[PDB]
Design a protein around this motif. Structure first.
Motif, PDB file in Angstrom:
ATOM      1  N   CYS B 269     -23.317  19.574 -59.606  1.00 13.68           N
ATOM      2  CA  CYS B 269     -22.822  19.197 -58.280  1.00 13.68           C
ATOM      3  C   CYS B 269     -21.262  18.390 -58.501  1.00 13.68           C
ATOM      4  O   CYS B 269     -20.340  18.948 -58.073  1.00 13.68           O
ATOM      5  N   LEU B 270     -21.198  17.882 -59.410  1.00 12.98           N
ATOM      6  CA  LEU B 270     -20.158  16.819 -59.844  1.00 12.98           C
ATOM      7  C   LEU B 270     -19.154  17.910 -60.328  1.00 12.98           C
ATOM      8  O   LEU B 270     -17.851  17.720 -60.165  1.00 12.98           O
ATOM      9  N   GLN B 271     -19.574  19.017 -61.083  1.00 11.06           N
ATOM     10  CA  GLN B 271     -18.780  20.001 -61.649  1.00 11.06           C
ATOM     11  C   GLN B 271     -17.828  20.645 -60.407  1.00 11.06           C
ATOM     12  O   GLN B 271     -16.646  20.836 -60.815  1.00 11.06           O
ATOM     13  N   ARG B 272     -18.222  21.189 -59.380  1.00 11.22           N
ATOM     14  CA  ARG B 272     -17.802  21.879 -58.435  1.00 11.22           C
ATOM     15  C   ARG B 272     -17.863  20.735 -57.080  1.00 11.22           C
ATOM     16  O   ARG B 272     -18.561  21.256 -56.157  1.00 11.22           O
ATOM     17  N   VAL B 273     -17.240  19.834 -56.981  1.00 10.42           N
ATOM     18  CA  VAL B 273     -17.427  18.815 -55.897  1.00 10.42           C
ATOM     19  C   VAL B 273     -15.872  18.479 -55.554  1.00 10.42           C
ATOM     20  O   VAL B 273     -15.051  18.368 -56.140  1.00 10.42           O
ATOM     21  N   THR B 274     -16.015  18.044 -53.952  1.00 12.74           N
ATOM     22  CA  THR B 274     -14.643  17.305 -53.622  1.00 12.74           C
ATOM     23  C   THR B 274     -14.629  15.760 -53.670  1.00 12.74           C
ATOM     24  O   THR B 274     -15.941  15.145 -53.490  1.00 12.74           O
ATOM     25  N   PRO B 275     -13.766  15.009 -53.562  1.00 11.82           N
ATOM     26  CA  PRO B 275     -13.557  13.414 -53.775  1.00 11.82           C
ATOM     27  C   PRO B 275     -14.417  12.772 -52.947  1.00 11.82           C
ATOM     28  O   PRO B 275     -15.183  11.843 -53.062  1.00 11.82           O
ATOM     29  N   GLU B 276     -14.607  13.493 -51.646  1.00 11.40           N
ATOM     30  CA  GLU B 276     -15.565  12.683 -50.607  1.00 11.40           C
ATOM     31  C   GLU B 276     -17.029  13.000 -51.021  1.00 11.40           C
ATOM     32  O   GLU B 276     -17.657  11.897 -51.284  1.00 11.40           O
ATOM     33  N   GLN B 277     -17.434  14.238 -51.520  1.00 12.02           N
ATOM     34  CA  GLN B 277     -18.720  14.342 -51.938  1.00 12.02           C
ATOM     35  C   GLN B 277     -18.874  13.592 -53.179  1.00 12.02           C
ATOM     36  O   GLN B 277     -20.200  13.203 -53.392  1.00 12.02           O
ATOM     37  N   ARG B 278     -17.947  13.615 -54.095  1.00 13.90           N
ATOM     38  CA  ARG B 278     -18.137  12.779 -55.175  1.00 13.90           C
ATOM     39  C   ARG B 278     -18.558  11.356 -55.105  1.00 13.90           C
ATOM     40  O   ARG B 278     -19.473  10.942 -55.673  1.00 13.90           O
ATOM     41  N   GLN B 279     -18.054  11.097 -54.106  1.00 21.05           N
ATOM     42  CA  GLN B 279     -18.121   9.533 -53.656  1.00 21.05           C
ATOM     43  C   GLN B 279     -19.442   9.440 -53.020  1.00 21.05           C
ATOM     44  O   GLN B 279     -20.230   8.545 -53.311  1.00 21.05           O
ATOM     45  N   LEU B 280     -20.055  10.632 -51.977  1.00 23.85           N
ATOM     46  CA  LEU B 280     -21.180  10.606 -51.524  1.00 23.85           C
ATOM     47  C   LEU B 280     -22.179  10.516 -52.502  1.00 23.85           C
ATOM     48  O   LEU B 280     -23.217   9.611 -52.486  1.00 23.85           O
ATOM     49  N   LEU B 281     -22.086  11.444 -53.607  1.00 22.99           N
ATOM     50  CA  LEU B 281     -23.036  11.644 -54.571  1.00 22.99           C
ATOM     51  C   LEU B 281     -23.300  10.289 -55.422  1.00 22.99           C
ATOM     52  O   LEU B 281     -24.476   9.940 -55.836  1.00 22.99           O
ATOM     53  N   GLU B 282     -22.085   9.783 -55.799  1.00 24.18           N
ATOM     54  CA  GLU B 282     -22.507   8.316 -56.426  1.00 24.18           C
ATOM     55  C   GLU B 282     -22.702   7.259 -55.504  1.00 24.18           C
ATOM     56  O   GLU B 282     -22.731   6.308 -55.850  1.00 24.18           O
ATOM     57  N   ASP B 283     -23.186   7.530 -54.117  1.00 20.73           N
ATOM     58  CA  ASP B 283     -23.370   6.627 -53.224  1.00 20.73           C
ATOM     59  C   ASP B 283     -24.830   6.708 -52.843  1.00 20.73           C
ATOM     60  O   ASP B 283     -25.675   5.775 -52.366  1.00 20.73           O
ATOM     61  N   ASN B 284     -25.354   8.058 -52.685  1.00 26.67           N
ATOM     62  CA  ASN B 284     -26.643   8.513 -52.159  1.00 26.67           C
ATOM     63  C   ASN B 284     -27.547   8.912 -53.087  1.00 26.67           C
ATOM     64  O   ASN B 284     -28.880   8.884 -53.138  1.00 26.67           O
ATOM     65  N   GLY B 286     -29.542   8.161 -56.153  1.00 25.92           N
ATOM     66  CA  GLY B 286     -29.966   7.137 -57.260  1.00 25.92           C
ATOM     67  C   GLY B 286     -30.756   6.017 -56.562  1.00 25.92           C
ATOM     68  O   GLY B 286     -31.134   5.001 -57.346  1.00 25.92           O
ATOM     69  N   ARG B 287     -31.606   6.399 -55.609  1.00 26.60           N
ATOM     70  CA  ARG B 287     -32.540   5.498 -55.070  1.00 26.60           C
ATOM     71  C   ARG B 287     -33.750   6.105 -54.077  1.00 26.60           C
ATOM     72  O   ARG B 287     -33.443   7.014 -53.506  1.00 26.60           O
ATOM     73  N   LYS B 288     -34.903   5.280 -54.070  1.00 24.69           N
ATOM     74  CA  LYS B 288     -35.989   5.682 -53.308  1.00 24.69           C
ATOM     75  C   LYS B 288     -35.803   5.409 -51.769  1.00 24.69           C
ATOM     76  O   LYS B 288     -36.381   4.217 -51.396  1.00 24.69           O
ATOM     77  N   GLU B 289     -35.303   6.429 -51.043  1.00 24.29           N
ATOM     78  CA  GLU B 289     -34.946   6.103 -49.646  1.00 24.29           C
ATOM     79  C   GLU B 289     -34.891   7.301 -49.038  1.00 24.29           C
ATOM     80  O   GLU B 289     -33.898   8.246 -49.132  1.00 24.29           O
ATOM     81  N   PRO B 290     -35.913   7.799 -48.137  1.00 22.36           N
ATOM     82  CA  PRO B 290     -35.753   9.231 -47.555  1.00 22.36           C
ATOM     83  C   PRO B 290     -34.452   9.629 -47.081  1.00 22.36           C
ATOM     84  O   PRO B 290     -34.002  10.845 -47.249  1.00 22.36           O
ATOM     85  N   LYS B 292     -30.696   8.525 -48.219  1.00 20.39           N
ATOM     86  CA  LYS B 292     -29.859   8.885 -49.134  1.00 20.39           C
ATOM     87  C   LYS B 292     -30.404  10.132 -49.971  1.00 20.39           C
ATOM     88  O   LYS B 292     -29.602  10.961 -50.315  1.00 20.39           O
ATOM     89  N   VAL B 293     -31.603  10.201 -50.337  1.00 17.16           N
ATOM     90  CA  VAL B 293     -32.094  11.098 -51.300  1.00 17.16           C
ATOM     91  C   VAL B 293     -32.027  12.536 -50.457  1.00 17.16           C
ATOM     92  O   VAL B 293     -31.172  13.537 -51.131  1.00 17.16           O
ATOM     93  N   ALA B 294     -32.406  12.706 -49.368  1.00 25.16           N
ATOM     94  CA  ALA B 294     -32.289  14.041 -48.630  1.00 25.16           C
ATOM     95  C   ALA B 294     -30.696  14.388 -48.328  1.00 25.16           C
ATOM     96  O   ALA B 294     -30.413  15.499 -47.925  1.00 25.16           O
ATOM     97  N   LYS B 295     -29.960  13.365 -48.498  1.00 25.58           N
ATOM     98  CA  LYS B 295     -28.316  13.458 -48.194  1.00 25.58           C
ATOM     99  C   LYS B 295     -27.917  14.370 -49.492  1.00 25.58           C
ATOM    100  O   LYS B 295     -26.741  14.745 -49.605  1.00 25.58           O
ATOM    101  N   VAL B 296     -28.463  13.757 -50.597  1.00 26.70           N
ATOM    102  CA  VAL B 296     -28.155  14.335 -51.866  1.00 26.70           C
ATOM    103  C   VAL B 296     -28.465  15.748 -52.056  1.00 26.70           C
ATOM    104  O   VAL B 296     -27.734  16.688 -52.489  1.00 26.70           O
ATOM    105  N   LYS B 297     -29.881  16.057 -51.629  1.00 22.41           N
ATOM    106  CA  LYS B 297     -30.384  17.518 -51.786  1.00 22.41           C
ATOM    107  C   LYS B 297     -29.472  18.431 -50.654  1.00 22.41           C
ATOM    108  O   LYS B 297     -29.380  19.668 -50.748  1.00 22.41           O
ATOM    109  N   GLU B 298     -28.791  17.830 -49.394  1.00 21.79           N
ATOM    110  CA  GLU B 298     -27.985  18.363 -48.467  1.00 21.79           C
ATOM    111  C   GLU B 298     -26.940  18.804 -49.158  1.00 21.79           C
ATOM    112  O   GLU B 298     -26.357  20.036 -48.877  1.00 21.79           O
ATOM    113  N   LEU B 299     -26.426  17.964 -49.704  1.00 20.32           N
ATOM    114  CA  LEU B 299     -24.893  18.311 -50.647  1.00 20.32           C
ATOM    115  C   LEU B 299     -25.299  19.325 -51.617  1.00 20.32           C
ATOM    116  O   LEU B 299     -24.260  20.261 -51.717  1.00 20.32           O
TER     117      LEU B 299
END
Lengths: 348, 348
Positions: B269-284, B286-290, B292-299
């Motif tokens: 993902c980090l490989q082929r990602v945009t600054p916004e998504q990168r930040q999103l990724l390092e924001d969503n 990494g934690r047990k919460e329905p 942020k998790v599913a937002k990582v999978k959406e990305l």
């Protein structure tokens, strides 16, 4: 002589920089696992070099006293030193793991590894790694030696025996109820043997023996006959000299009753105690509080441990003489005498 | 055939009661260390028997495909089985220690050992003990074998390599800042290799090889050429099939992004990602919460991982064919084909 003894120690000590270079030199810079080994160097340097080295130094004294002039060359002496550092790394791995399952704080005058920042629970995997080091040093120095697979078996075995006693301990002495129903003669003894005597006394000389060819089950069992004994007297001493001695000392210098430690004294107190004192003992022995602690020490002194120790160590250095003159037929008796000298001298 | 395959599995499975009897039978009742081993039986039974056994079962399939009719007797087949159970105990020790430094909860559908009552931190010393078991089974079955010291060296070595990758992991992926600056191609790869490929694929067959005499550095290195590869494709698969697959599955069945897991996808993902998504990724991520998790999978799905996987595993099973036809000159190619069959079949 001090001249000789001292000289031997410095020779061993100054080898550790070499050992470190043996375990990491090439790992470092490897474009895949370099940082892992880069950190290994630190685990190595932080936990390994520390004590008197009295354990690893025993290998050196033993091979010296056992080899004939045809096997006292550079290449053979360095394997003496290297196999000596293998005992030391044998201890360092047990120690690191020990502290963690004890939630200890200080060791060798410094902060336990896991307590270091960033570290913590990774310390377990570094306990595994130091152990992985005992066998990579064996392979560097002895892989092309007739004795190799003997050393290899000796280590993987004593490691199994200390691990067994380590668990007898973790069972016998549990905080839960603390329990004084377990602290008994044969269980205390059974803990000193496996957890300590084995890798502390037999292991060192046993590796000196295999190096000069002596692999006879009989002579080895004659080594266990007396090293397993000094291993007993050593622990008893390093348990008595705890509360009851100070005027010059070293090691786990301080005291520890805060920990429900199945020590000699305890077993000895419960041995010859009255119902009231027994209850007192299972009421004051087991916590960090100036009050209860000193009341445990008052009782030990009230009961008569200063006597119990004397008549024992007074018979110990005797039994030993009879265990030597009866077990040092092939093996040079001087080996045990010299070892006993660093041991048999208590502080009251 | 299933008839054969299935038959082999049941033969291995039914041997564990035997192994247990090998490791404890005599410890039990010994008037000094009996309770220690008495408890060992429990550590053994609780943590060892569990998976598909696909690892230890590979030894058996390999020696079968490699031995000539003169070495297919009872006494030789049982050493095949026993050395197979040694891989299994190799895994059980790493697993127990793994869970503890992860504060895990469930494993093999049960509660991690240390989480069991009474246990806790003693689990470390039982990790040491299962490992001590890999070498006592080797010694029971192979001590009088020309191949012995080869197996001994293989194990103490792969144990060192997995331990190295285990630490690359504990570093790369730390909760602290979590950090996505580390989750990269060569570091992810470097973790799959040491931490997994080695003891999972090379180790098994490598022990089959040493047993039929094949100890040539060249043929062994031709084994690393392709097992270290299926070990890659296996982990990638067992990382992709995580969020993106369900219709029939097994293993670490569920999902785990709650843990900052340096998995394939993340690096991809980090490989082929945009600054916004990168930040999103390092924001969503990494934690047990329905949430942020599913937002990582959406990305991941938003970016294009379903494609990234295909073209890869579409090239993987190809490279492998070219790594076989180029590395299976002496060694029977059927060994890898048969192994690949249990692997190369993904779920979308």
């Amino acid at each position: 002589s001090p001249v000789v003894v001292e000289r031997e120690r410095e020779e061993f000590v100054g080898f550790f920089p070499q050992i470190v270079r043996d375990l990491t030199e090439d790992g470092i810079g490897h474009p895949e696992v370099g940082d892992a080994v880069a950190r290994l160097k630190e685990v190595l340097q932080y936990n390994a070099p520390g004590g008197k080295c009295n354990r690893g130094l025993t290998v050196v004294a033993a091979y010296r006293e056992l080899s004939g002039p045809g096997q006292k060359d550079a290449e053979s002496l360095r394997c003496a030193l290297a196999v000596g550092w293998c005992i030391e790394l044998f201890q360092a791995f047990f120690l690191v793991a020990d502290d963690i399952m004890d939630q200890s704080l200080t060791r060798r005058g410094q902060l336990c590894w896991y307590k270091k920042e960033g570290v913590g629970l990774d310390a377990i995997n570094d306990s595994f790694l130091l152990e992985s080091s005992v066998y990579r040093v064996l392979k560097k120095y002895c892989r092309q030696r007739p004795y190799y697979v003997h050393l290899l078996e000796l280590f993987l075995q004593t490691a199994y025996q200390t691990e067994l006693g380590q668990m007898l301990d973790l069972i016998t002495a549990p905080v839960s109820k603390v329990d004084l129903s377990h602290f008994s003669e044969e269980r205390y003894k059974a803990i000193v043997k496996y957890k300590t005597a084995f890798y502390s006394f037999y292991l060192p000389v046993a590796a000196a023996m295999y190096m000069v060819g002596i692999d006879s089950k009989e002579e080895h069992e004659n080594a266990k006959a007396i090293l397993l004994e000094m291993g007993e007297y050593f622990q008893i001493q390093d348990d008595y000299l705890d509360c009851f001695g100070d005027p010059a000392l070293t090691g786990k210098v301080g005291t520890d009753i805060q920990d429900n430690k199945c020590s000699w004294l305890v077993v000895q107190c419960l041995q010859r105690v009255t119902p009231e004192q027994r209850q007192l003992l299972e009421d004051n022995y087991g916590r960090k509080e100036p009050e209860k602690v000193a009341k445990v020490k008052e009782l030990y002194e009230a009961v008569g441990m200063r006597a119990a120790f004397q008549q024992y160590e007074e018979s110990s250095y005797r039994r030993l003489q009879e265990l030597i003159e009866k077990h040092s037929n092939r093996l040079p008796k001087e080996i045990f005498l010299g070892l006993a000298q660093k041991i048999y001298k208590r502080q009251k």
